[PDB]
From a paper:
Many of currently used antibiotics inhibit protein synthesis in pathogenic microorganisms by targeting their 70S ribosomes, which are complex macromolecular machines responsible for this process. The catalytic peptidyl transferase center (PTC) located at the heart of the large ribosomal subunit (50S in bacteria) polymerizes amino acids into polypeptides in the order specified by the nucleotide sequences of the translated mRNAs. Newly-made proteins emerge from the ribosome through the nascent peptide exit tunnel (NPET) that spans the body of the large ribosomal subunit beginning at the PTC and ending on the opposite side of the large ribosomal subunit facing the cytoplasm. Here, we discover that well-known ribosomal antibiotics, hygromycin A (HygA) and macrolides, which target peptidyl transferase center and peptide exit tunnel, respectively, can act cooperatively against susceptible and drug-resistant bacteria.
The activity of HygA-macrolide pairs against bacteria harboring erm resistance genes prompted us to determine X-ray crystal structures of HygA-macrolide combinations bound to the Erm-methylated 70S ribosome containing N6-dimethylated residue m26A2058. Using our recent methodology, Erm-modified 70S ribosomes were isolated from Tth cells expressing the erm-like gene from Bifidobacterium thermophilum. Co-crystallization of these Erm-methylated ribosomes with PY and the same HygA-macrolide pairs as before (HygA-ERY, HygA-AZI, and HygA-TEL) provided crystals diffracting to 2.35–2.65 Å resolution. Remarkably, the observed electron-density maps revealed strong peaks corresponding to HygA and the macrolides (ERY, AZI, or TEL) bound to the A2058-N6-dimethylated ribosomes (respectively), allowing us to build molecular models unambiguously. In the case of TEL alone (without HygA), the observed electron density is somewhat stronger and less fragmented than that of ERY, in agreement with the residual binding affinity of ketolides for the Erm-methylated ribosome. In the WT ribosome, this water molecule is coordinated by the nucleobase of A2058 and the phosphate of G2505 and serves as a binding partner for the dimethylamino moiety of the functionally critical desosamine sugar of a macrolide. In the Erm-methylated ribosome, this water molecule is displaced due to direct sterical hindrance with the methyl groups appended to the A2058 residue, rationalizing the significantly reduced affinity of macrolides to the Erm-modified ribosome. However, the overall binding positions of ERY, AZI, or TEL on the A2058-methylated 70S ribosome in the presence of HygA appear to be nearly identical to their binding sites in the WT ribosome. Interestingly, the dimethylamino moiety of the desosamine sugars of ERY, AZI, or TEL rotates by ~180° around the C-N bond and finds a new H-bonding partner—the carbonyl oxygen of the fucofuranose ring of ribosome-bound HygA.
Residue numbers in the entry:
A (entry chain 1D): 2 to 276
B (entry chain 17): 1 to 48
Write the structure that this text describes.
Amino acid sequence: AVKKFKPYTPSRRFMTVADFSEITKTEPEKSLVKPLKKTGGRNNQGRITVRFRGGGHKRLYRIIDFKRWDKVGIPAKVAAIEYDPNRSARIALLHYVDGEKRYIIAPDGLQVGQQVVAGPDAPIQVGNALPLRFIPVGTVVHAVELEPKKGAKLARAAGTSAQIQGREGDYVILRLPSGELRKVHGECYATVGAVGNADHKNIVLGKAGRSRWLGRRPHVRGAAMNPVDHPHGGGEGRAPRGRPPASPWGWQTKGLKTRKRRKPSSRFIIARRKK
Amino acid sequence: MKRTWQPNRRKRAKTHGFRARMRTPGGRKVLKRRRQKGRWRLTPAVRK
RNA sequence: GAGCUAGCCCUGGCCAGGGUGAAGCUGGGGUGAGACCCAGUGGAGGCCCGAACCGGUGGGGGAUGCAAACCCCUCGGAUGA
RNA sequence: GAAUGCCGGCAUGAGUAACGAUAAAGAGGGUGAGAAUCCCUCUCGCCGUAAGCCCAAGGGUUCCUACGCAAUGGUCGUCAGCGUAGGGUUAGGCGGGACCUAAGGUGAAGCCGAAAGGCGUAGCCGAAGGGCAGCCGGUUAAUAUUCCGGCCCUUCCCGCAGGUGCGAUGGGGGGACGCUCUAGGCUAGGGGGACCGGAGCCAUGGACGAGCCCGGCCAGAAGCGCAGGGUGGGAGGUAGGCAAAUCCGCCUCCCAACAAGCUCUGCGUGGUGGGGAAGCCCGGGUGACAACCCCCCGAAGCCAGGGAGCCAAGAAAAGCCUCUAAGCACAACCUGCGGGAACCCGUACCGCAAACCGACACAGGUGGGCGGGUGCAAGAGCACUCAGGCGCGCGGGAGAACCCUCGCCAAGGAACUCUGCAAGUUGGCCCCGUAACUUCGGGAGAAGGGGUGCUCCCUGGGGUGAUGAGCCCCGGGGAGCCGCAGUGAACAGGCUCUGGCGACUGUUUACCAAAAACACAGCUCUCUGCGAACUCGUAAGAGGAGGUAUAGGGAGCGACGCUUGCCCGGUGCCGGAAGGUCAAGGGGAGGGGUGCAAGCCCCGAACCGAAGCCCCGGUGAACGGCGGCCGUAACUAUAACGGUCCUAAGGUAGCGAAAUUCCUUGUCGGGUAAGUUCCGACCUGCACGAAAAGCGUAACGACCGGAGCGCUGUCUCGGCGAGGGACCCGGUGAAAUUGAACUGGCCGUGAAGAUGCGGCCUACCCGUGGCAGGACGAAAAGACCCCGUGGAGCUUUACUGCAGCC
RNA sequence: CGAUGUCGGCUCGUCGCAUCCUGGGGCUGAAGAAGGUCCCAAGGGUUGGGCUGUUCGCCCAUUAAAGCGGCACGCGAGCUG
RNA sequence: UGGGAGAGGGUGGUGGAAUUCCCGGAGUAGCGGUGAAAUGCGCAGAUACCGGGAGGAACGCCGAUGGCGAAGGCAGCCACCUGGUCCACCCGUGACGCUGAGGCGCGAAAGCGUGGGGAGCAAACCGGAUUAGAUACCCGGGUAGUCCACGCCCUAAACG
RNA sequence: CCGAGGGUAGGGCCCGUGACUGGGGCGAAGUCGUAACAAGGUAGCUGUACCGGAAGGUGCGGCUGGAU
Ligand SMILES: [Mg+2]
Ligand SMILES: [Mg+2]
Ligand SMILES: [Mg+2]
Ligand SMILES: [Mg+2]
Ligand SMILES: [Mg+2]
Ligand SMILES: [Mg+2]
Ligand SMILES: [Mg+2]
Ligand SMILES: [Mg+2]
Ligand SMILES: [Mg+2]
Ligand SMILES: [Mg+2]
Ligand SMILES: [Mg+2]
Ligand SMILES: [Mg+2]
Ligand SMILES: [Mg+2]
Ligand SMILES: [Mg+2]
Ligand SMILES: [Mg+2]
Ligand SMILES: [Mg+2]
Ligand SMILES: [Mg+2]
Ligand SMILES: [Mg+2]
Ligand SMILES: [Mg+2]
Ligand SMILES: [Mg+2]
Ligand SMILES: [Mg+2]
Ligand SMILES: [Mg+2]
Ligand SMILES: [Mg+2]
Ligand SMILES: [Mg+2]
Ligand SMILES: [Mg+2]
Ligand SMILES: [Mg+2]
Ligand SMILES: [Mg+2]
Ligand SMILES: [Mg+2]
Ligand SMILES: [Mg+2]
Ligand SMILES: [Mg+2]
Ligand SMILES: [Mg+2]
Ligand SMILES: [Mg+2]
Ligand SMILES: [Mg+2]
Ligand SMILES: [Mg+2]
Ligand SMILES: [Mg+2]
Ligand SMILES: [Mg+2]
Ligand SMILES: [Mg+2]
Ligand SMILES: [Mg+2]
Ligand SMILES: [Mg+2]
Ligand SMILES: [Mg+2]
Ligand SMILES: [Mg+2]
Ligand SMILES: [Mg+2]
Ligand SMILES: [Mg+2]
Ligand SMILES: [Mg+2]
Ligand SMILES: [Mg+2]
Ligand SMILES: [Mg+2]
Ligand SMILES: [Mg+2]
Ligand SMILES: [Mg+2]
Ligand SMILES: [Mg+2]
Ligand SMILES: [Mg+2]
Ligand SMILES: [Mg+2]
Ligand SMILES: [Mg+2]
Ligand SMILES: [Mg+2]
Ligand SMILES: [Mg+2]
Ligand SMILES: [Mg+2]
Ligand SMILES: [Mg+2]
Ligand SMILES: [Mg+2]
Ligand SMILES: [Mg+2]
Ligand SMILES: [Mg+2]
Ligand SMILES: [Mg+2]
Ligand SMILES: [Mg+2]
Ligand SMILES: [Mg+2]
Ligand SMILES: [Mg+2]
Ligand SMILES: [Mg+2]
Ligand SMILES: [Mg+2]
Ligand SMILES: [Mg+2]
Ligand SMILES: [Mg+2]
Ligand SMILES: [Mg+2]
Ligand SMILES: [Mg+2]
Ligand SMILES: [Mg+2]
Ligand SMILES: [Mg+2]
Ligand SMILES: [Mg+2]
Ligand SMILES: [Mg+2]
Ligand SMILES: [Mg+2]
Ligand SMILES: [Mg+2]
Ligand SMILES: [Mg+2]
Ligand SMILES: [Mg+2]
Ligand SMILES: [Mg+2]
Ligand SMILES: [Mg+2]
Ligand SMILES: [Mg+2]
Ligand SMILES: [Mg+2]
Ligand SMILES: [Mg+2]
Ligand SMILES: [Mg+2]
Ligand SMILES: [Mg+2]
Ligand SMILES: [Mg+2]
Ligand SMILES: [Mg+2]
Ligand SMILES: [Mg+2]
Ligand SMILES: [Mg+2]
Ligand SMILES: [Mg+2]
Ligand SMILES: [Mg+2]
Ligand SMILES: [Mg+2]
Ligand SMILES: [Mg+2]
Ligand SMILES: [Mg+2]
Ligand SMILES: [Mg+2]
Ligand SMILES: [Mg+2]
Ligand SMILES: [Mg+2]
Ligand SMILES: [Mg+2]
Ligand SMILES: [Mg+2]
Ligand SMILES: [Mg+2]
Ligand SMILES: [Mg+2]
Ligand SMILES: [Mg+2]
Ligand SMILES: [Mg+2]
Ligand SMILES: [Mg+2]
Ligand SMILES: [Mg+2]
Ligand SMILES: [Mg+2]
Ligand SMILES: [Mg+2]
Ligand SMILES: [Mg+2]
Ligand SMILES: [Mg+2]
Ligand SMILES: [Mg+2]
Ligand SMILES: [Mg+2]
Ligand SMILES: [Mg+2]
Ligand SMILES: [Mg+2]
Ligand SMILES: [Mg+2]
Ligand SMILES: [Mg+2]
Ligand SMILES: [Mg+2]
Ligand SMILES: [Mg+2]
Ligand SMILES: [Mg+2]
Ligand SMILES: [Mg+2]
Ligand SMILES: [Mg+2]
Ligand SMILES: [Mg+2]
Ligand SMILES: [Mg+2]
Ligand SMILES: [Mg+2]
Ligand SMILES: [Mg+2]
Ligand SMILES: [Mg+2]
Ligand SMILES: [Mg+2]
Ligand SMILES: [Mg+2]
Ligand SMILES: [Mg+2]
Ligand SMILES: [Mg+2]
Ligand SMILES: [Mg+2]
Ligand SMILES: [Mg+2]
Ligand SMILES: [Mg+2]
Ligand SMILES: [Mg+2]
Ligand SMILES: [Mg+2]
Ligand SMILES: [Mg+2]
Ligand SMILES: [Mg+2]
Ligand SMILES: [Mg+2]
Ligand SMILES: [Mg+2]
Ligand SMILES: [Mg+2]
Ligand SMILES: [Mg+2]
Ligand SMILES: [Mg+2]
Ligand SMILES: [Mg+2]
Ligand SMILES: [Mg+2]
Ligand SMILES: [Mg+2]
Ligand SMILES: [Mg+2]
Ligand SMILES: [Mg+2]
Ligand SMILES: [Mg+2]
Ligand SMILES: [Mg+2]
Ligand SMILES: [Mg+2]
Ligand SMILES: [Mg+2]
Ligand SMILES: [Mg+2]
Ligand SMILES: [Mg+2]
Ligand SMILES: [Mg+2]
Ligand SMILES: [Mg+2]
Ligand SMILES: [Mg+2]
Ligand SMILES: [Mg+2]
Ligand SMILES: [Mg+2]
Ligand SMILES: [Mg+2]
Ligand SMILES: [Mg+2]
Ligand SMILES: [Mg+2]
Ligand SMILES: [Mg+2]
Ligand SMILES: [Mg+2]
Ligand SMILES: [Mg+2]
Ligand SMILES: [Mg+2]
Ligand SMILES: [Mg+2]
Ligand SMILES: [Mg+2]
Ligand SMILES: [Mg+2]
Ligand SMILES: [Mg+2]
Ligand SMILES: [Mg+2]
Ligand SMILES: [Mg+2]
Ligand SMILES: [Mg+2]
Ligand SMILES: [Mg+2]
Ligand SMILES: [Mg+2]
Ligand SMILES: [Mg+2]
Ligand SMILES: [Mg+2]
Ligand SMILES: [Mg+2]
Ligand SMILES: [Mg+2]
Ligand SMILES: [Mg+2]
Ligand SMILES: [Mg+2]
Ligand SMILES: [Mg+2]
Ligand SMILES: [Mg+2]
Ligand SMILES: [Mg+2]
Ligand SMILES: [Mg+2]
Ligand SMILES: [Mg+2]
Ligand SMILES: [Mg+2]
Ligand SMILES: [Mg+2]
Ligand SMILES: [Mg+2]
Ligand SMILES: [Mg+2]
Ligand SMILES: [Mg+2]
Ligand SMILES: [Mg+2]
Ligand SMILES: [Mg+2]
Ligand SMILES: [Mg+2]
Ligand SMILES: [Mg+2]
Ligand SMILES: [Mg+2]
Ligand SMILES: [Mg+2]
Ligand SMILES: [Mg+2]
Ligand SMILES: [Mg+2]
Ligand SMILES: [Mg+2]
Ligand SMILES: [Mg+2]
Ligand SMILES: [Mg+2]
Ligand SMILES: [Mg+2]
Ligand SMILES: [Mg+2]
Ligand SMILES: [Mg+2]
Ligand SMILES: [Mg+2]
Ligand SMILES: [Mg+2]
Ligand SMILES: [Mg+2]
Ligand SMILES: [Mg+2]
Ligand SMILES: [Mg+2]
Ligand SMILES: [Mg+2]
Ligand SMILES: [Mg+2]
Ligand SMILES: [Mg+2]
Ligand SMILES: [Mg+2]
Ligand SMILES: [Mg+2]
Ligand SMILES: [Mg+2]
Ligand SMILES: [Mg+2]
Ligand SMILES: [Mg+2]
Ligand SMILES: [Mg+2]
Ligand SMILES: [Mg+2]
Ligand SMILES: [Mg+2]
Ligand SMILES: [Mg+2]
Ligand SMILES: [Mg+2]
Ligand SMILES: [Mg+2]
Ligand SMILES: [Mg+2]
Ligand SMILES: [Mg+2]
Ligand SMILES: [Mg+2]
Ligand SMILES: [Mg+2]
Ligand SMILES: [Mg+2]
Ligand SMILES: [Mg+2]
Ligand SMILES: [Mg+2]
Ligand SMILES: [Mg+2]
Ligand SMILES: [Mg+2]
Ligand SMILES: [Mg+2]
Ligand SMILES: [Mg+2]
Ligand SMILES: [Mg+2]
Ligand SMILES: [Mg+2]
Ligand SMILES: [Mg+2]
Ligand SMILES: [Mg+2]
Ligand SMILES: [Mg+2]
Ligand SMILES: [Mg+2]
Ligand SMILES: [Mg+2]
Ligand SMILES: [Mg+2]
Ligand SMILES: [Mg+2]
Ligand SMILES: [Mg+2]
Ligand SMILES: [Mg+2]
Ligand SMILES: [Mg+2]
Ligand SMILES: [Mg+2]
Ligand SMILES: [Mg+2]
Ligand SMILES: [Mg+2]
Ligand SMILES: [Mg+2]
Ligand SMILES: [Mg+2]
Ligand SMILES: [Mg+2]
Ligand SMILES: [Mg+2]
Ligand SMILES: [Mg+2]
Ligand SMILES: [Mg+2]
Ligand SMILES: [Mg+2]
Ligand SMILES: [Mg+2]
Ligand SMILES: [Mg+2]
Ligand SMILES: [Mg+2]
Ligand SMILES: [Mg+2]
Ligand SMILES: [Mg+2]
Ligand SMILES: [Mg+2]
Ligand SMILES: [Mg+2]
Ligand SMILES: [Mg+2]
Ligand SMILES: [Mg+2]
Ligand SMILES: [Mg+2]
Ligand SMILES: [Mg+2]
């Protein structure tokens, strides 16, 4: 449930903040963090390759366990739920009876004190992880691998989930968060439940300053520029687009599909996204 | 007002210095040309 | 050629004093329980006034200048993008 | 002889402008060939969150002393950051290196690229971050945490003693972190003392005093005291920490647990070592056997890795500790003690500036620390002033115009003007009080008004003591006194009503635009299933992202409220296994060249053969578009209504003479004595209109309009006064410009605006202060305009290519 | 065109006369007073304000009158902008 | 105290029929729709048929002139949580009662806000008819909405 | 000291009036269509919502004060 402010400044009128209610611990595990090397959007040539990035709060990267088939059969106790500045999901600290400590992304409904486990034999309960082929059809699931042992790729952001829809051969059919219907190999691991912090999308940033804390520099419209800069540049006074609306690099940006046509994974995609 | 020359000894040696020139095809042509012209100094003097 | 300037990255530093008084908390009131109201506590904010600091609004001066952009008065921001 | 030619020399302007902040000078003595300018003394003025002191950059001998004055110094010069010479910088503990890692750079392995080269996990380099042992005083002309003195400390080597399973580049702990707010206790720093020490003073009417003036500390091992930081202890189990592990992690039990214990830091004390004023006397002597105490205020600094709250969730590595592996366990390590050993580089001086960046001894720019006192509510603000530092490297007169900066003004009070531009007014604090409207925060310091000094008396609470006096902070009541005036000086909003635009704080054309422009939360379209789309790169590699559709890219719109209509024929995008067209290639009917021949060589029809295009359909917060004419109602007028041409369809809601309205100062209403502006209306909208969004909107604005009140030298309309110049004298002494000049007016003439030609008029020779009508005055080979088969930026359904994609 | 700066205002004037006023006249459909029209006449004079960048013009209150033109649409090495 | 009936309310789950859509198969010259038609869809393979899948909404028979609730209103089935109500016993209390200005709560549908969902239906809208015309009735499309959560709105022929 | 009242400033209520504008009542000799009363030629009415020259239409739900 997102929190609101009284309008005691112009920006607090609309600003909203996460309530941070699931958070039970306010410092990361020291042995599970490393420095997150800020890029400013610049590549190894020093060139900006993603515009308008930089200047956000310093962050430490929390090492997340996106495998879990790593430790089949070894249960762990959910020791804490924490904030992670590098993702929209919250993260949950796991204490394995092994003594090993790792982070997973916190599912919706996880409780500190409960246990979770991974493997072909794990009970179908929130926070457990199994190869897809052992999760009952209809189960909503998250942190799904795309190919076996390659690491969880799908349904990782706050509130998202995939639904198991059916089985065909070595493969399982998933409804991804985008509504796409996709075959995924049955030996791919998933974790049962949806990702937590589902209210993330109701945050109202409230002021320009708040984007800046997030490392989002101001985005300037092509129409505000000159012809040297952008297809929409120029014109006396305001100007409509005067041509098919385009990117700074000239390609059309209202409908033009851009997935590569001869891509091998097309054989595994059943239905393009909806909406 | 703040003008263009703001001397800095490290910056000087690291930008125009002998080792920077030698690191690079164009920088070695600088030294080659400056020796052929008979320059008394091949790179800028900076105190260090 | 980025010792000027623009942006980003790493690591440090700086922001007198005063004002306003959000949430929360506590107490009292209220109710079937509440919402809520009141007081105290509290100390939030691209909040207010104002130096340093960052600016450069209007006028005057300067105009072979003190200065190839300066000077006086006035003026904007000053915990923040 | 000319090229705004080139190089050099030398003129003119001209003894002209100027001599670089309006903080300011005067005199006496000295030196010397020479003195406003150097030294000394007295007086005066200026800075004092600096214009004083310390550090880092940068600079590189500018430092100190002697001897000098040609040049440098905006004058002068005996002086100097200048010339010549001599001297001067001293470290195990300060900074850097023999330590660590950050971005980044480099780069074994590896990857890529015609060459050159580009990348690249480890490693290495890389600091103003981490880490690490020195404080106070004395001394030199010039260095001092460096020399010396006193008291401390670090590492390395060796040795002795005691102790222990010792041992690492490997494992683990730790190092290790934000923002805002903040407790307790201290210290730095400061104020007061009738107390302690002190040379002396009694003036000019009074005072021999609880008088004046001066000072009343600094460092310090162990120990101790006070205040804090850090840390749970034992056993058992163990499959994780890429070997091992007794360590760490996990589970369980016991005790201890906001106590303690151990440990570390700060502060105080502490053997000991220092310092030590005014005044007087010639930096030194004296003061002095100096005294060295009490009270109060008190940090943003210290204890510190403290505490709380919050969201935007806040380096690494080494030192250090612990664990074990090879090994080795006569070794090795640990603790104490002792002796020895301890390298390289920097250190002068300037450092908000005459020594740095600005060509200059340039009113500009330059990061960190200290930055005293009193009063003003506070403060780093303001005024004065301490220590300390200065009077700004031309002066002397005069007392015009004019200019600058400043002060005042009768009566009027915006009549000024494009505009109240400018300048007045207002101005801090306390108290009373405060509207529409509103998103309920605000609007608000709304507006408007009262108080403000000093004296006496009474008294309230808080801090420090002790619970009292004393001190200190915030008060309250009564009664009085003085002046024109009590934030008595300095620093310190003029206010209101009403439109446009932009929601808001922000950002911008460095150096003519700060805005209504950009950005902005927020809204919508669209792409992207992850080796993502997209971006840079030939590539490898990177960013995206160690992210995963509540995510990432592109586009438009721009808080919020209420909304966002109709047209898909054209263009775009999306969908469409049919059909048409469709290149290489496949196919080979048929035909040709040549050879005596087999054969060799060539042309070539049907047929098969992709994307693309054509074709079918969808699609507007995709590019975009959103009519005309005739007729009709009891009077006129108009036309709900009908007709008809055209179209893809004919502009909806809302708004409208508008940041849009040509005609236009439309018309009407408001305001004014008077209103091309402004506000409110009307609608024949030349030429509004719904995300190039439409219409509104509280709050906000150095934005742009209109009005009023207050107040004014803006003005009627000008006067006076001040200082810095202008002016005169001494010193120094530019500049653009310049065919040459012995350079008047009129009326004509002349390439059409004549000092220069004609006629006539006027006119003795030469300067000085002034004014700008002319010399088609200076500057800049006109930016406008045209021309050149000149250039460059930009666009596209111009042409032709290319990357990219299919 | 190797540059002749532009509208309007302010300031400062000066000139022409086809005269706005004041002075002198003739004619009148001039009783008087007040006008109309023409002639002579350039000596002097020819207001303040609202609107608008305005010149101009309209308006307010006055006036003897509120003249019209030239001087590089006079005057930016005089100012404004 | 001991019993009963009930679509009374709230929460979580769950079943089958049907519509539409997607895939596979089979098949071809129309289907659909109306008073009659046309638009629409269909040789780019529709309709009709069979198999598989997805998804939302509503619950046939039982079902009634029925039941329950204060009203609005409530209907597959299971469980949990929970309200009202009736009956028998005549056991307890001892008038503890009725009404009720204000207040507070509830309050069909449509509508609003934020998020989700979207099969069918369907304001607005587009097109075909009808008609003198037809901004309607009928037909083919079709967006809000209808559905869920939370917050508003507070109306009605909210009627007996 | 209080004090009629006068003066400055800011609020509240009420009346009269205003370019222009909204609908209402009445007049009736007009133009358009015909929504309701019969099954009124689409049963009517209804709250709400969206739309249309106009009466009105349609959606959702409700009522019978509906003919057969
Ligand atoms: Mg929650
Ligand atoms: Mg809020
Ligand atoms: Mg709040
Ligand atoms: Mg709230
Ligand atoms: Mg606001
Ligand atoms: Mg919160
Ligand atoms: Mg949470
Ligand atoms: Mg990382
Ligand atoms: Mg990174
Ligand atoms: Mg790199
Ligand atoms: Mg590079
Ligand atoms: Mg960027
Ligand atoms: Mg998180
Ligand atoms: Mg969140
Ligand atoms: Mg948002
Ligand atoms: Mg961030
Ligand atoms: Mg953005
Ligand atoms: Mg933008
Ligand atoms: Mg532009
Ligand atoms: Mg460019
Ligand atoms: Mg281009
Ligand atoms: Mg372009
Ligand atoms: Mg354009
Ligand atoms: Mg244009
Ligand atoms: Mg433009
Ligand atoms: Mg335009
Ligand atoms: Mg533009
Ligand atoms: Mg534009
Ligand atoms: Mg614009
Ligand atoms: Mg255009
Ligand atoms: Mg456009
Ligand atoms: Mg166009
Ligand atoms: Mg592309
Ligand atoms: Mg795949
Ligand atoms: Mg610099
Ligand atoms: Mg230099
Ligand atoms: Mg340097
Ligand atoms: Mg340096
Ligand atoms: Mg450097
Ligand atoms: Mg170098
Ligand atoms: Mg040279
Ligand atoms: Mg040499
Ligand atoms: Mg060189
Ligand atoms: Mg830092
Ligand atoms: Mg500040
Ligand atoms: Mg308070
Ligand atoms: Mg709290
Ligand atoms: Mg602020
Ligand atoms: Mg503030
Ligand atoms: Mg402020
Ligand atoms: Mg200025
Ligand atoms: Mg001014
Ligand atoms: Mg002035
Ligand atoms: Mg000037
Ligand atoms: Mg200045
Ligand atoms: Mg100034
Ligand atoms: Mg301020
Ligand atoms: Mg401040
Ligand atoms: Mg701010
Ligand atoms: Mg010649
Ligand atoms: Mg010349
Ligand atoms: Mg010349
Ligand atoms: Mg020449
Ligand atoms: Mg020359
Ligand atoms: Mg000369
Ligand atoms: Mg002279
Ligand atoms: Mg002269
Ligand atoms: Mg002298
Ligand atoms: Mg002399
Ligand atoms: Mg002297
Ligand atoms: Mg001071
Ligand atoms: Mg130098
Ligand atoms: Mg020295
Ligand atoms: Mg020297
Ligand atoms: Mg000399
Ligand atoms: Mg000399
Ligand atoms: Mg000289
Ligand atoms: Mg000089
Ligand atoms: Mg001499
Ligand atoms: Mg000198
Ligand atoms: Mg010497
Ligand atoms: Mg030493
Ligand atoms: Mg060594
Ligand atoms: Mg290293
Ligand atoms: Mg390299
Ligand atoms: Mg270092
Ligand atoms: Mg050191
Ligand atoms: Mg020490
Ligand atoms: Mg020395
Ligand atoms: Mg030991
Ligand atoms: Mg960390
Ligand atoms: Mg750090
Ligand atoms: Mg901050
Ligand atoms: Mg404290
Ligand atoms: Mg001390
Ligand atoms: Mg004090
Ligand atoms: Mg006496
Ligand atoms: Mg203590
Ligand atoms: Mg073990
Ligand atoms: Mg002494
Ligand atoms: Mg002695
Ligand atoms: Mg003594
Ligand atoms: Mg502070
Ligand atoms: Mg957050
Ligand atoms: Mg942290
Ligand atoms: Mg690292
Ligand atoms: Mg061994
Ligand atoms: Mg060595
Ligand atoms: Mg030194
Ligand atoms: Mg100096
Ligand atoms: Mg300065
Ligand atoms: Mg100095
Ligand atoms: Mg110099
Ligand atoms: Mg000087
Ligand atoms: Mg200077
Ligand atoms: Mg001090
Ligand atoms: Mg004051
Ligand atoms: Mg003050
Ligand atoms: Mg100030
Ligand atoms: Mg003083
Ligand atoms: Mg002076
Ligand atoms: Mg004179
Ligand atoms: Mg001055
Ligand atoms: Mg006056
Ligand atoms: Mg006035
Ligand atoms: Mg007045
Ligand atoms: Mg004005
Ligand atoms: Mg004033
Ligand atoms: Mg004042
Ligand atoms: Mg008002
Ligand atoms: Mg309010
Ligand atoms: Mg506000
Ligand atoms: Mg106001
Ligand atoms: Mg007094
Ligand atoms: Mg002052
Ligand atoms: Mg003020
Ligand atoms: Mg004013
Ligand atoms: Mg107002
Ligand atoms: Mg206007
Ligand atoms: Mg607007
Ligand atoms: Mg703005
Ligand atoms: Mg703007
Ligand atoms: Mg707005
Ligand atoms: Mg906005
Ligand atoms: Mg803004
Ligand atoms: Mg600000
Ligand atoms: Mg410019
Ligand atoms: Mg500019
Ligand atoms: Mg420039
Ligand atoms: Mg410029
Ligand atoms: Mg300017
Ligand atoms: Mg500007
Ligand atoms: Mg501004
Ligand atoms: Mg801009
Ligand atoms: Mg903008
Ligand atoms: Mg919006
Ligand atoms: Mg590229
Ligand atoms: Mg890569
Ligand atoms: Mg990446
Ligand atoms: Mg990455
Ligand atoms: Mg991502
Ligand atoms: Mg914008
Ligand atoms: Mg815009
Ligand atoms: Mg509103
Ligand atoms: Mg329409
Ligand atoms: Mg179209
Ligand atoms: Mg189209
Ligand atoms: Mg169509
Ligand atoms: Mg086109
Ligand atoms: Mg053949
Ligand atoms: Mg032949
Ligand atoms: Mg094809
Ligand atoms: Mg739309
Ligand atoms: Mg078109
Ligand atoms: Mg468009
Ligand atoms: Mg008629
Ligand atoms: Mg109009
Ligand atoms: Mg008008
Ligand atoms: Mg308008
Ligand atoms: Mg227009
Ligand atoms: Mg026109
Ligand atoms: Mg007009
Ligand atoms: Mg006009
Ligand atoms: Mg008018
Ligand atoms: Mg105006
Ligand atoms: Mg105007
Ligand atoms: Mg009109
Ligand atoms: Mg646009
Ligand atoms: Mg526009
Ligand atoms: Mg508007
Ligand atoms: Mg507004
Ligand atoms: Mg603004
Ligand atoms: Mg502004
Ligand atoms: Mg004056
Ligand atoms: Mg005076
Ligand atoms: Mg004067
Ligand atoms: Mg003077
Ligand atoms: Mg004077
Ligand atoms: Mg004389
Ligand atoms: Mg001559
Ligand atoms: Mg001539
Ligand atoms: Mg002539
Ligand atoms: Mg002549
Ligand atoms: Mg002659
Ligand atoms: Mg002749
Ligand atoms: Mg002649
Ligand atoms: Mg004459
Ligand atoms: Mg002249
Ligand atoms: Mg002159
Ligand atoms: Mg001449
Ligand atoms: Mg001239
Ligand atoms: Mg001239
Ligand atoms: Mg030329
Ligand atoms: Mg030319
Ligand atoms: Mg030209
Ligand atoms: Mg030129
Ligand atoms: Mg031309
Ligand atoms: Mg040509
Ligand atoms: Mg030609
Ligand atoms: Mg070109
Ligand atoms: Mg010309
Ligand atoms: Mg010339
Ligand atoms: Mg010229
Ligand atoms: Mg008569
Ligand atoms: Mg006559
Ligand atoms: Mg006559
Ligand atoms: Mg005259
Ligand atoms: Mg005359
Ligand atoms: Mg006018
Ligand atoms: Mg006019
Ligand atoms: Mg007129
Ligand atoms: Mg009169
Ligand atoms: Mg003229
Ligand atoms: Mg003319
Ligand atoms: Mg003309
Ligand atoms: Mg002229
Ligand atoms: Mg004129
Ligand atoms: Mg002129
Ligand atoms: Mg001028
Ligand atoms: Mg002019
Ligand atoms: Mg001139
Ligand atoms: Mg002139
Ligand atoms: Mg001239
Ligand atoms: Mg002007
Ligand atoms: Mg202008
Ligand atoms: Mg076929
Ligand atoms: Mg039934
Ligand atoms: Mg019934
Ligand atoms: Mg009984
Ligand atoms: Mg309701
Ligand atoms: Mg409903
Ligand atoms: Mg609804
Ligand atoms: Mg649908
Ligand atoms: Mg019709
Ligand atoms: Mg709608
Ligand atoms: Mg809606
Ligand atoms: Mg009923
Ligand atoms: Mg009276
Ligand atoms: Mg009807
Ligand atoms: Mg009818
Ligand atoms: Mg009917
Ligand atoms: Mg309508
Ligand atoms: Mg009509
Ligand atoms: Mg309809
Ligand atoms: Mg009902």
